[PDB]
């Protein structure tokens, strides 16, 4: 059954998500405006991602055990996971109706052609949409969604990690919490192999991360594109 500790973890993660995800998207007004007449969507989506990096950091900080990490280990975990967590969290605005991310208005509704106008090809974008579709098909409980974000961040195998054993221990605590949550709270048939499926999505995200990285390296190699980015994006994603 779910221990008291485990239900505590869940409550904390739900709150941390509610504190860092504004389902009104009101802050989008502050971004450089979307332009859809090349790379016309890069300023707007660069800003979106920059905002989102900030929110993901604020979520990460609230993950039980995360603070016990070194500063260096917190830094490497966020650097490698940020894109993956933005892809994960983005699923909540994502809609199967038109395979787009719908952030409350036509201006902030993003489709495959918009992403394309930020400098990215179908080699990223097609697997990104399929990922969004498969995740949506899981119909996760919000509790599952926040746990999966946290397990994504606190991954022991990330490049640069120093205290692997400690990152492992934090994550195992969250993995066990997720496994037990599914067993106690998620009815069959939806529960069928749901943990393994959720772990497969984390492998999908590694692959998405790699592809995004290579297309980012290309895009940002040109200084006129790198200019349209934000300082946080350059720092977290590289230069």
């Amino acid at each position: 059954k779910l221990s008291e500790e485990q239900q505590h973890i869940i409550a904390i993660l739900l709150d941390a998500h509610h504190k860092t995800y504004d389902p009104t998207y009101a802050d989008f007004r502050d971004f450089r405006p979307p332009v859809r007449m090349p790379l016309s969507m890069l300023p707007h989506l660069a800003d979106l991602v920059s905002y989102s990096i900030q929110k993901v950091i604020g979520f990460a900080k609230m993950i039980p055990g995360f603070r016990d990490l070194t500063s260096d280990d917190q830094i490497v975990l966020l650097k490698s996971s940020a894109i993956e967590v933005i892809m994960l969290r983005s699923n909540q605005s994502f809609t199967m109706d038109d395979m787009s991310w719908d952030c409350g208005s036509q201006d902030y509704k993003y489709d495959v052609t918009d992403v394309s106008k930020a400098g990215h090809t179908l080699e990223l974008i097609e697997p990104l949409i399929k990922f969004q579709v498969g995740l949506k098909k899981l119909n996760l409980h919000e509790e599952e969604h926040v746990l999966l974000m946290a397990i994504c961040i606190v991954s022991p195998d990330r490049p640069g990690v120093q205290d692997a054993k400690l990152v492992e221990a934090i994550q195992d605590r969250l993995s066990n919490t997720l496994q037990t949550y599914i067993r106690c709270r998620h009815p069959p048939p939806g529960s069928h192999q749901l943990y393994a499926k959720m772990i497969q999505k984390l492998a999908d995200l590694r692959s998405l991360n790699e592809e995004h990285s290579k297309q980012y390296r290309s895009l940002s190699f040109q200084p006129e594109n790198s200019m349209k980015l934000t300082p946080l994006v350059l720092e977290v994603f590289g230069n």
Binding site: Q54, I57, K61, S71, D72, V76, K79, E235
Partner: peptide
């Protein structure tokens, strides 16, 4: 790292 903004947002 060499990551002042990240390090600052983290605490």
């Amino acid at each position: 790292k060499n990551h002042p903004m990240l390090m600052n947002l983290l605490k």
